Design a protein around this ligand. Sequence first.
Ligand SMILES: *[C@@H]1O[C@H](CO)[C@@H](O)[C@H](O)[C@H]1NC(C)=O
Ligand SMILES: *C(=O)c1ccc(NC(=N)N)cc1
Ligand SMILES: [Ca+2]
Lengths: 242, 129
Amino acid sequence: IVGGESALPGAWPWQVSLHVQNVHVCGGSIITPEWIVTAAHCVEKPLNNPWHWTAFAGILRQSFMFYGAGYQVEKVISHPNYDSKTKNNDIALMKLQKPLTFNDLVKPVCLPNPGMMLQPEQLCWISGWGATEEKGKTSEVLNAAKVLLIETQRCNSRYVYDNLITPAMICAGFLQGNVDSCQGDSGGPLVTSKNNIWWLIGDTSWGSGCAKAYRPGVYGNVMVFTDWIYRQMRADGEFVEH
Amino acid sequence: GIECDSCINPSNWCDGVSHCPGGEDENRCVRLYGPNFILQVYSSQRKSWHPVCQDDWNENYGRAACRDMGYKNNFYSSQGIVDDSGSTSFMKLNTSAGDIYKKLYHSDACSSKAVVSLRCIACGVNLND
Ligand SMILES: *[C@@H]1O[C@H](CO)[C@@H](O)[C@H](O)[C@H]1NC(C)=O
Ligand SMILES: *C(=O)c1ccc(NC(=N)N)cc1
Ligand SMILES: [Ca+2]
């Protein structure tokens, strides 16, 4: 997160740090005690196998994510129509071996319902351990920042992303920059507060640089993916009934 | 016509019989609408989603609706509220029926004047308000 601030305990109880080889790779968002929403490009081969991934929840600091605090990932499911070249359908689901324990520091974010009626420039928040500046290293402390939704028409402009924003993507940030997600925030939450409920409206996907002018963050439109998300958990719920 | 994955007739979408090879026509028949979690069900005959009335709804019906949406045994709250979804047609419980989406029938009003608000999980809450 570039241009944001360090998160306090309980501020973003859904944010998880996904680890491979004892280091943070991507962010995720808890929706149920066993299901985390992340980005498909995080789990591209060779990280498509579940045994590579550990999820850390309720821990703000990377150096505090000790051996024994992590949750082993049991299943990884990339979106069936993911395109690694266009980042279209950049959504993936991770199932945990042991369900999370919910308290003030670990809680799920609500999946977006149809009829949200969000503002065209809705105030949003992005959190993650991503770089605090372009090409920087992972952030030790969890960071967060306010971003504004950017209408796809404007984001698809010729001086912004020139028709690269698909209906499976939403844009968030500031066309002047200085506040944006960055590498390491990918898969992390883009959430908004409405009706005193936090809604996961996007998952951090891609962008040209970090916090550069006229290059805002592009986020996977979770709203479009909810039908796929519901089908995956329901299908798992019936297999595991065995 | 509605597609399964890349085509059926919308009267055979959410009709209680699996017609798609992957069952896509019968697994996405229940949804929550709006920031107030209005419980809605898809009507095959009307090719539209409609709110569920609070009339004769209980916790166990919600847990069934929660299971059909993929939330398994997760259930948080279910109360009757005024319909803010601008809908004109609703779905009423049978009570003599014997599936949650096929246990409702079309109705142009609700006797309780309320629709089901269904929260399958306690989410969306941080340290602040
Ligand atoms: C409810 O289901 C029973 C079962 O046969 C049926 O006889 C009855 O007419 C149904 N009522 C409505 C209005 O759906
Ligand atoms: C993921 O690591 C990721 C997501 C998004 C960006 N770009 C911007 N938000 N500008 C970079 C990296
Ligand atoms: Ca059918």
